[PDB]
Amino acid sequence: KLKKVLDKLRLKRKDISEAAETVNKVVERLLRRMQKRESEFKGVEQLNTGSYYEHVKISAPNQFNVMFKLEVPRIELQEYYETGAFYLVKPLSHFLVLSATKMLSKFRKIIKEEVKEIKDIDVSVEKEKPGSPAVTLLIRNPEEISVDIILALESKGSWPISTKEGLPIQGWLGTKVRTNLRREPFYLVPKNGNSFQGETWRLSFSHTEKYILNNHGIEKTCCESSGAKCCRKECLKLMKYLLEQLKKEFQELDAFCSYHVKTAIFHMWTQDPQDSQWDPRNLSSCFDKLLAFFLECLRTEKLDHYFIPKFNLFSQELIDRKSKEFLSKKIEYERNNGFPIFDKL
Amino acid sequence: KLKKVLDKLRLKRKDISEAAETVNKVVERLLRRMQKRESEFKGVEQLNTGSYYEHVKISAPNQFNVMFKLEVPRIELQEYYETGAFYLVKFNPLSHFLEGEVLSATKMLSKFRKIIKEEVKEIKDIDVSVEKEKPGSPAVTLLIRNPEEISVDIILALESKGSWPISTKEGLPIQGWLGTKVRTNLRREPFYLVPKNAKDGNSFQGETWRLSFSHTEKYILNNHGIEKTCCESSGAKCCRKECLKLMKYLLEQLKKEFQELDAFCSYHVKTAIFHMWTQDPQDSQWDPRNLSSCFDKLLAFFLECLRTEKLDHYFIPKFNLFSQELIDRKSKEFLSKKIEYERNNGFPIFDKL
DNA sequence: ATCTGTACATGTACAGAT
DNA sequence: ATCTGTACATGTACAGAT
DNA sequence: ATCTGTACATGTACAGAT
DNA sequence: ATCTGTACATGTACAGAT
Ligand SMILES: Nc1ncnc2c1ncn2[C@@H]1O[C@H](COP(=O)(O)OP(=O)(O)OP(=O)(O)O)[C@@H](O)[C@H]1O
Ligand SMILES: Nc1ncnc2c1ncn2[C@@H]1O[C@H](COP(=O)(O)OP(=O)(O)OP(=O)(O)O)[C@@H](O)[C@H]1O
Ligand SMILES: [Mg+2]
Ligand SMILES: [Mg+2]
Ligand SMILES: [Zn+2]
Ligand SMILES: [Zn+2]
């Protein structure tokens, strides 16, 4: 049943090769233009993030996330109205308070200029979507591929106080891992008609999340060549697919994204830390317990950011009750009728 | 029972404070003197190693190991007659230690030791001297008299950042225990070469160096579980270190009574337990409730090593620490009888002093 | 004036003490 | 159970040097 | 500072074995 | 049906060279 779906969802080696070869060309050239030109983003470094680099991308290698991160010395953060995730912040002179919109606009300008000069790849820059920190590339290998270039500020200080109680991995990955993770930099991305709209940045833990995905067992050998396989990634994939399929069919679900599922499974991996609670033989009960957890998040209207406990991704302000009830009904239907949506194209 | 022995063996915070305060002074001052002037050892860095920094030092904080490690770029190793552990080194502030491209361990050690003695003479704050050089030892050993006796072994080491020598390829067999990512990451760290410093009267006597994995061993001791939470505040305690301590004590007590055991050292027990931790990787095979069977299975393993004359270096599989060349059969049989005796009569030697 | 090797500043795991 | 000293990893301030 | 070379983890693909 | 072993592909950390 679910093994068959996972077979469908598995990327093909051939497609992986073709997609990656084209993407790396475009990205390499963009990264070079950010330094070889005396741009205000000289020193920016590349960090690959999201599902493709975590090995949980499903169906096709058609969406790539990449961070162009810029180290900024001793910045001062001021939290935005107790939200936990959003901050004002203090070469960059002409982006003054460091304005996210002004900095993003210049960043975006550079990329567009450079993209116009690319003559061997069919590639363009997608119209800016308000509410997105990314510059999005649309590549036409014969097949459609999207690349989100995310601008990020990199700070090396202590993580902000709103995260103090986040990353609750102590009983799963442990205290040494947590302490070491919190010694890495933290990232601010320009996520953005009220208030301090254009000067607000959002914390990003994409780097931490990538380490977690690739080091996800309570045992060091989980999913390694001299360890046992678990089904943690496979459940993420199934849940991701369920949401994608539903979203494709129902405009009512526009406010939901894969990060909601990722966040939910992070909490499930914390609640059920033992690798034996994710035995491949138990794929079905595991998938099912994840569904039940997600439904409880929907019912209670509560899905805390894993890194920022006070930030509720399912607050009324972000996603209307109607949407959450709608998604509850549709998930409950699929669950009670053997997931017919998994059988469609 | 063994819990009571472990109570005796536990270091006291007071003693730890007094010992460490004095040790860190002496070491800090020695390290600073190595950076002065055109000393050949400018750039040498401190790495704390061995039982005290692994939290398996027993009885008293009276012996501390420290490495003064020097990065040497552009190094060619030539293995010494297929031994796995021993190397010539080839290629500069080290100019004065070279003989036609070959780095002399004994000349370098001698200068290192000269500088330390000179500096120690200038310390009027604590009662400290340099122990007569012991043949077969790379260390400059400091004898400190806080009112209590404390030894500090300062080991000179060459640090190479290249890939570990081929003799180690099959060593560190941690894949089923700590895993492949840990193994890979550990093998990306530098390797260390220390002076072999025998006066056996063999070819290349003064130019032979020995591999050291003290840094790797320290990481292993402090990250010893198959679960990442082993011995942590939101995990379960294991008894891996406690078994190491008990076995260490058994050997120390025996060694202090019996001159026949001079050839044995604590590294033999450390190596044996590393193999036992590989053989029995699950944290559940080191439950604290099972301290006795765990200690017992370790003893039985060590006894088999003694009987079969085989204890492979954990990093260098072909190097046999129990070879005939190192330890005569009589010594191994002697230690076998004494271990079997203690084991069969309730460990009376644990009740001594 | 600017730069930097050295030492202080901060945070926490480990394990001993209460 | 909670508290506390040491070790150790990383970030950063600055006297003395350039 | 930038670039390449090496090593090996995480994947996929498929035959032959269980 | 599943598992195991080998081949074949990409990503990624870091040393040593330029
Ligand atoms: N709303 C959000 N808040 C915080 N971080 C987010 C948010 N949306 C996405 N991200 C971060 O950006 C990364 C990439 O986003 P993206 O939408 O491409 O999802 P993904 O995890 O790559 O999965 P997929 O692309 O397969 O749907 C996420 O993994 C996450 O770290
Ligand atoms: N024969 C040896 N071969 C290889 N390395 C050795 C040998 N003897 C000692 N070492 C290394 O030197 C370190 C310090 O040596 P030392 O004799 O002080 O042992 P230790 O582990 O500190 O135990 P303790 O001091 O409590 O007996 C060891 O931990 C080990 O890494
Ligand atoms: Mg993505
Ligand atoms: Mg020692
Ligand atoms: Zn796993
Ligand atoms: Zn443990």
Q: Where are the domains of chain B?
A: 1-11+164-190+213-353, 12-163+191-212
Q: Which amino acid is at B219?
A: Y
* Total residues found in chain B within this entry: 353
Strand E positions within 7 A of protein Cβ atoms: 1-3, 6-13
Q: Which residues have a Cβ under 8 Å from the Cβ of A245 and sit 6 or more positions away? A: A341, A342, A344
| Listed residue (B127, B121, B122, B216) closest to B178, CA to CA | B216
* CB pair distance less than 8 Å for A224 and B179: yes
Name the residue facing A219 among B175, B227, B232 (closest C-beta). Answer: B227
A192 lines ligand 1 (CB under 6 A): no
* CB pair distance less than 8 Å for B228 and A177: yes
| Chain A residues with beta carbon closer than 8 angstroms to that of B234 | 170-171, 174-175
Cβ B193 vs Cβ B109: under 8 Å: no
Q: Which 3-state string (H, E, C) describes chain A?
A: CHHHHHHHHCCCHHHHHHHHHHHHHHHHHHHHHHHHCCCCCCCCEEEEECHHHHCCCCCCCCEEEEEEEEECCCCCEEECCCCCCEEEECCCHHHCCCCHHHHHHHHHHHHHHHHHCCCCCCEEECCCCCCCCEEEEEEECCCEEEEEEEEEEEECCCCCHHHCCCCCCCCCCCHHHHHHHCCCCEEEECCCCCCCHHHCEEEECHHHHHHHHHCCCCECCCCCCCCCCCCHHHHHHHHHHHHHHHHHHCHHHCCCCHHHHHHHHHHHHHHCCCHHHHCHHHHHHHHHHHHHHHHHHHHHCCCECCCCCCCECCCCCCCCHHHHHHHHHHHHHHHHCCCHHHHCC
**Which of B234, B277, B283 is most worth mutating to test chain A (most A CB atoms within 10 A of its CB)?**
B234
A209 lines ligand 1 (CB under 6 A): yes
* Cα B313 to averaged position of ligand 2 atoms, centre (Å): 13
Name the residue facing B229 among A171, A215, A226 (closest C-beta). Answer: A171
The residue contributing the CA closest to ligand 2 atom 3 is B267
Cβ burial of B233 (10 Å; 0-12, 13-18, 19+) is exposed
> Which CA-bearing residue is nearest the C1' of F11?
A53
Q: Which of B64, B65, B254, B321 to mutate to test the pocket of ligand 2 (most atoms within 8 A of CB)?
A: B65
* CB pair distance less than 8 Å for A220 and B176: no
Name the residue facing A220 among B178, B233, B235 (closest C-beta). Answer: B178
- Phi first, then psi: what are they for B139, rounded to 5°? -95, 145
**Quick one: which ligand is closest to B239's CA?**
6
Dist CA A179 CA B16 (whole Å): 26
* Cα B287 to averaged position of ligand 6 atoms, centre (Å): 9
What angle do helix axes B214-222 and B266-279 make, rounded to 10 degrees?
A: 50
Cβ A90 vs Cβ A79: under 8 Å: no
Cβ B307 vs Cβ B336: under 8 Å: yes
Dist CA A92 CA B248 (whole Å): 61
| Listed residue (B217, B229, B175) closest to A221, CA to CA | B175
- β B63-71/A186-189 pair status: unpaired
User: Tokens in use for B45?
Assistant: 């860095």
Q: How far is the CA of B135 from the C1' of E15 (A)?
A: 60
* Cα B101 to averaged position of ligand 6 atoms, centre (Å): 46
| Listed residue (A283, A292, A228, A332) closest to A1, CA to CA | A283
Q: How far is B9 from chain A (nearest CA, A)?
A: 27
User: Tokens in use for A177?
Assistant: 């891992």
- The method of structure determination was X-ray
Q: Which 3-state string (H, E, C) describes chain B?
A: CHHHHHHHHCCCHHHHHHHHHHHHHHHHHHHHHHHCCCCCCCCCEEEEECCCCCCCCCCCCCEEEEEEEEECCCCEEEECCCCCCEEEEECCCCHHHEECCEECHHHHHHHHHHHHHHHHHCCCCCEEEECCCCCCCCEEEEEEECCCEEEEEEEEEEEECCCCCHHHCCCCCCCCCCCHHHHHHHCCCCEEEEECCCCCCCCCHHHCEEEECHHHHHHHHHCCCCECCCCCCCCCCCCHHHHHHHHHHHHHHHHHHCHHHCCCCHHHHHHHHHHHHHHCCCHHHHCHHHHHHHHHHHHHHHHHHHHHCCCECCCCCCCECCCCCCCCHHHHHHHHHHHHHHHHCCCHHHHCC
User: Tokens in use for A282?
Assistant: 């138990």
Residue contacts between A and B (CB atoms, under 8 Å): 58
Strand D positions within 7 A of protein Cβ atoms: 5-13
C-alpha angle A302-A303-A305 in degrees, rounded to nearest 5: 135
Name the residue facing B175 among A170, A176, A226 (closest C-beta). Answer: A226
Residues in A 150-169 whose C-beta is less than 7 A from nucleic strand D are: 156-157
Name the residue facing A218 among B176, B180, B227 (closest C-beta). Answer: B227
| Listed residue (B140, B95, B98) closest to B119, CA to CA | B140
Footprint of strand C on the protein (CB under 7 A): A 158, 175-176, 178-179, 182; B 10-14, 16, 32, 35, 55, 222, 231-233, 241
User: Tokens in use for B79?
Assistant: 């293995």
Determine the residue of chain A that is closest to B229 in CA distance.
Answer: A174
Q: Which residues have a Cβ under 8 Å from the Cβ of A53 and sit 6 or more positions away? A: A65, A210
Determine the residue of chain B that is closest to A225 in CA distance.
Answer: B180
* Cα A148 to averaged position of ligand 1 atoms, centre (Å): 10
Dist CA A224 CA B134 (whole Å): 46
The reply to whether A274 Cβ lies less than 7 angstroms from strand E is no
Footprint of strand F on the protein (CB under 7 A): A 3, 13, 16-17, 20-21, 23-24, 48, 53, 210, 280; B 73-74, 160-162, 188
Interface residues from chain B to A (CB-CB < 8 Å): 175-182, 223, 226-229, 232-235
Dist CA A315 CA A261 (whole Å): 15
Q: Which amino acid is at B353?
A: L
Dist CA A269 CA A264 (whole Å): 9
Per-residue burial over A111-129, b = 16 or more CB atoms within 10 Å of its CB, e = otherwise:
beebbeebeeeebebeeee
* Cα B279 to averaged position of ligand 1 atoms, centre (Å): 42
> Which CA-bearing residue is nearest the C1' of F12?
A48
**Quick one: which ligand is closest to A150's CA?**
1
The residue contributing the CA closest to ligand 1 atom 25 is A51
